[PDB]
Structure formats: structure tokens, C-alpha cells
């Protein structure tokens, strides 16, 4: 349940995902389940260089997280 | 020659400039954001405008050539 996820479970997730460019940013960051799930776009776009195509990558995999839930 | 998604950075670059020479200009745009297939198709008027800096005339020639080849996904507009 993604809402119980530490920052950890966030890197395991982004790894499977084919994401695994992101996941160090995210730790830094310290982005856990709860941080995960709340993350708007305007939020990602910082966390991933200001670089549009990877935020909303990234925003579209957390809405599909979102959906089987 | 392939599915929209499975466009590389080039091969949307290739879309867009040979639809509208006008936005060849905007080619090194497209690849500091890594706009590939997959992120192009996911685009919307807001974030071109806001986090990419397009014009409004670019923007909006920009939503049409997705709405071309994103199938059924909702119409882009301003």
C-alpha cells in the first residue's frame, strides 16, 4: 500500500518501472509513499531538472499507482 | 514508419519539422526536455506553455500534430 512505503519502497518502485534514473534524486529528496502520493506536477518538475517529458512520465505512473489501489 | 509511443527524441523531432518547418526551430527544445514518443503523447497545452516556453502560435501547432497520431486520447487545445 503505497501509502505505508518508506523512501526505499519509492526507489524499488521507480526501479521496476523502468525509472531507476530517478530514484537517487527522490531519496535525496527524501520522497516516501505519503510524499509519493501527494507530488503534483509542479512539485515533480524540480525533482527531475526542470525536464518536462520524465515529469510527466513520472506523474503518469503515480496516477496509474493511484488507480489499482 | 512506427507507433507514436515508440518514437525516439529524433523521431518526434522528424514529425514535428516535417508537418511545420516553422518548428524545426524548436528541436533543441524538445530534446532538453526528452520529448520522446511516449512523453509527447502524455503533453498537454499547460505544460508547453508553462515548463517549455512555447509561444502561443508554436504551442498550438504543436497540440494539433499530437492530436493527429494520439488516437483517441483527448484532443490537446489551448
Same mark, same amino acid.
Given at each position: 500500500?503505497?501509502?505505508?512505503?518508506?523512501?526505499?519502497?519509492?526507489?524499488?518502485?521507480?526501479?521496476?518501472?523502468?525509472?531507476?534514473?530517478?530514484?537517487?534524486?527522490?531519496?535525496?529528496?527524501?520522497?516516501?509513499?505519503?510524499?509519493?502520493?501527494?507530488?503534483?506536477?509542479?512539485?515533480?518538475?524540480?525533482? +527531475?531538472?526542470?525536464?518536462?517529458?520524465?515529469? +510527466?512520465?513520472?506523474?503518469?505512473?503515480?496516477?496509474?499507482?493511484?488507480?489499482?489501489? | 514508419?512506427?507507433?507514436? /509511443?515508440?518514437?525516439?527524441?529524433?523521431?518526434?523531432?522528424?514529425? /514535428?519539422?516535417?508537418?511545420?518547418?516553422?518548428?524545426?526551430?524548436?528541436?533543441?527544445?524538445? =530534446?532538453?526536455? %526528452? /520529448?520522446?514518443?511516449? @512523453?509527447?503523447?502524455?503533453?498537454?497545452? %499547460?505544460?508547453?506553455?508553462?515548463?517549455?516556453?512555447?509561444?502561443?502560435?508554436? @504551442?498550438?501547432? /504543436?497540440?494539433?500534430?499530437?492530436?493527429?497520431?494520439?488516437? =483517441? =486520447?483527448?484532443?490537446? @487545445?489551448?
Amino acid at each position: 500500500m503505497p501509502d505505508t512505503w518508506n523512501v526505499y519502497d519509492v526507489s524499488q518502485f521507480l526501479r521496476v518501472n523502468d525509472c531507476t534514473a530517478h530514484c537517487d534524486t527522490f531519496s535525496r529528496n527524501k520522497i516516501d509513499g505519503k510524499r509519493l502520493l501527494q507530488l503534483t506536477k509542479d512539485d515533480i518538475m524540480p525533482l +527531475l531538472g526542470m525536464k518536462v517529458g520524465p515529469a +510527466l512520465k513520472i506523474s503518469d505512473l503515480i496516477a496509474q499507482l493511484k488507480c489499482k489501489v | 514508419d512506427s507507433m507514436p /509511443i515508440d518514437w525516439t527524441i529524433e523521431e518526434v523531432i522528424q514529425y /514535428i519539422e516535417s508537418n511545420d518547418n516553422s518548428l524545426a526551430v524548436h528541436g533543441d527544445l524538445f =530534446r532538453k526536455h %526528452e /520529448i520522446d514518443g511516449k @512523453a509527447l503523447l502524455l503533453l498537454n497545452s %499547460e505544460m508547453m506553455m508553462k515548463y517549455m516556453g512555447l509561444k502561443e502560435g508554436p @504551442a498550438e501547432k /504543436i497540440c494539433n500534430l499530437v492530436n493527429k497520431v494520439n488516437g =483517441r =486520447r483527448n484532443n490537446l @487545445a489551448l
